[PDB]
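assembly run, all chains below
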Amino acid sequence: SYTIDINCSTGDTQANLVLTEIPAEPYVHVSGDNKSTIEYLDTGSDNSLLVRPTQQFNCVSSQYPYRNYSKIPRSQQDPLAVRREFYTRRVEYWRKADASNVDAPEYTLPQSCSIRLASTVTKETTAADIAGIVLRTLAPIFPNGSGDWIKLQQLIDGLPRIFG
Amino acid sequence: SYTIDINCSTGDTQANLVLTEIPAEPYVHVSGDNKSTIEYLDTGSDNSLLVRPTQQFNCVSSQYPYRNYSKIPRSQQDPLAVRREFYTRRVEYWRKADASNVDAPEYTLPQSCSIRLASTVTKETTAADIAGIVLRTLAPIFPNGSGDWIKLQQLIDGLPRIFG
Amino acid sequence: SYTIDINCSTGDTQANLVLTEIPAEPYVHVSGDNKSTIEYLDTGSDNSLLVRPTQQFNCVSSQYPYRNYSKIPRSQQDPLAVRREFYTRRVEYWRKADASNVDAPEYTLPQSCSIRLASTVTKETTAADIAGIVLRTLAPIFPNGSGDWIKLQQLIDGLPRIFG
Amino acid sequence: SYTIDINCSTGDTQANLVLTEIPAEPYVHVSGDNKSTIEYLDTGSDNSLLVRPTQQFNCVSSQYPYRNYSKIPRSQQDPLAVRREFYTRRVEYWRKADASNVDAPEYTLPQSCSIRLASTVTKETTAADIAGIVLRTLAPIFPNGSGDWIKLQQLIDGLPRIFG
Amino acid sequence: SYTIDINCSTGDTQANLVLTEIPAEPYVHVSGDNKSTIEYLDTGSDNSLLVRPTQQFNCVSSQYPYRNYSKIPRSQQDPLAVRREFYTRRVEYWRKADASNVDAPEYTLPQSCSIRLASTVTKETTAADIAGIVLRTLAPIFPNGSGDWIKLQQLIDGLPRIFG
Amino acid sequence: SYTIDINCSTGDTQANLVLTEIPAEPYVHVSGDNKSTIEYLDTGSDNSLLVRPTQQFNCVSSQYPYRNYSKIPRSQQDPLAVRREFYTRRVEYWRKADASNVDAPEYTLPQSCSIRLASTVTKETTAADIAGIVLRTLAPIFPNGSGDWIKLQQLIDGLPRIFG
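ok done. output:
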């Protein structure tokens, strides 16, 4: 009868963050084919550059999920809890050029983004429960989802105070 | 006139990742400059815990955007390009209990999720362009958006090969 | 001709902190001397507990009102003035239980609050003047009096920055 | 289903203790850390004194709420419950002088007042519940609120028998 | 009856130094929100640069205002005097470019200016008295106020001898 | 043809800061080269003090105007730009006494104020443009010019937040 209550603040409003699909067919094994860490290459990239878009994924598990959480008493630590984490890092390499002037040089613009999710898990932790924390981390940066980029832009401007 | 090509593989289909808003009112500034990392406390949590949900936002910028990327020739480095980086880390503290049994203990379960993004930004780089990199990082894990959690389940199960 | 000016910042607005009366009839002397320190016990409490609500009062006075205030020069120390001080400490023990479930255990929740007022009194120091310092000590915690409890809630939550 | 009962004696009558607001705008951090203890200085005071009015705030919390309350048995100690505590200390320095006689010397009159609230909080402990203990601590000293100052005057006069 | 005589040379002539207002609405907290040192950012600046106009203000007070003034005898040092100082530093970043030729590069020109005012203050020191020393420091550089820039220009030319 | 944009927030309103001239005749060259700092003595002061009012002027120039500014890319550094800097420090020595009382002591009160300005100067930078930076540094402190002293009073009172 145990239930999991997120101890958060959640609103009534909802927004659509619109993801465009990324096909698996163009991706190729690079390192760690069988192992807990894998790195893929997107071969839908410019043949002739030295850099090409990669995305890696790796998973980690720990037996002691409360190791870094000392402000929690043992009397409240679930002794059946196990720590599951995963980590993705996508690097892509954009190309700026204009077809108008071929004299003008082509530049390579690197971009990288990484997400690390580390949950404690017991028998009542669900897939959607864990998905919720990613969506709540995203929510304050994209408060209208794909609609406007206002908070994102102010993060690019160097204005870290998002809630004030 | 220069255009930016995301050297990358995209698809035709699109999914909705449905974000639920997080109201800004309950968050309280706790620590940090703009020069340091800003930290907020979600005060809409169980007061009777000594751990409470926090999300933090840090962002930093550099005039040397190619410092980490080694295999990009100078002839391809945009001299006007700048490095813009931001980093968020949300820690929430879930609570498991059941109203069926006043005699059975309650446990607090820690969860953390962190997103870092470093874009090379030039004149033609738009806020939408930069949101694209986060959206493409997310898309392989949530290929149907909020619809299903199959690939996320794999990542938690310890299977890192999203693409196979 | 002498007037006393509080050297403070005060506003135009006012608010009602609404007190509910504490009947004297039930309290009983438990310890101390009727000269210096007295501890009353609220007999309006449960018989069956070893703890019962008690409020203590304690007065002292000194001919050396500037003893700890070293940074006031003698040219500005009023030689007629004299130090008066009182201290109250209320301890109440709350009782939590649900009448729906008599199997569910009852708990005792201790709560305690103390006020210490030390004034330097001179000929022109009045009752109302000395009340003013208690009122101005409270006003930061109760900016709207009984109207809301927001700043008090912040104090309990552990957020000491009340003036920002 | 659990309810919290104050184990106290309360009356039917109510009175307004009327607070005048303390503007936050003039206060300035002078010492401490923004985490535990902070001391603000009222810049709305005289430049020419080495002493200026200052109000300090200080919060602490503990996982052992029954540490000093030895006379409560473990069968009645709520294991979920946790100790929260705050402390405020306002020091203001009054200025006595008559404008009629500028030959007559001006004096500095120090006044100081401190409030310490330590509650054991549990899931059902509310903001208003914790405010109640401060209000019931005040009510013996201010039986009519701002209406008269008689009991406060007795305290200053040195007469600690407030309930008779 | 004490009066403050500036021990200076002052003329009969006066000039208008014409200040154009700087609105507070565009300015944003950066560091030290509550503390004695604050740094603001002018967000009416170019979004896309790495540098943006800031102005900081910080205040300092000292108990020993005669510390660095040894040529003054104790018999003439006001023992009630207190040292108050403040310091502002404004950095702005100009942009030179012509809309005629977009080939031509845009340059960023940094400019910085700082004012430090450190007064001894007694009960008879007035706001306008302290304002006077800033106006007298400015007076020889801008002897016709906003009218002509002759002495300013000769300071930019490296000709320090202003009175000869 | 290149134009200079002060990347900055300005307002429509203008105030007069009323400067009173300082006659050059009473000042006497005391120390310093053009290579050193020039120092003048205001000989229109009380001879019977061993301290007398002095104002000094130093100015220095460098071919490397971006040395202190780190986050400006070379692609945005004007190769023709030069750094012009000047620095003035006025010390006056006030005198407090009263003609009402020959028996009461006189005191001398030191005051100092210093302005430093370092502009990046290029072909298009005019003397007026450079005066602008001093005028905009002054304007937040004197938002109504010589009219009122409210913000200056705050700075002296120890409240650094001019903009809030």
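The first strand of chain B starts at residue 3 and ends at 5.

Residues 46 and 52 of chain B are 7 Å apart (CA to CA).

not gonna interpret more than that til we talk
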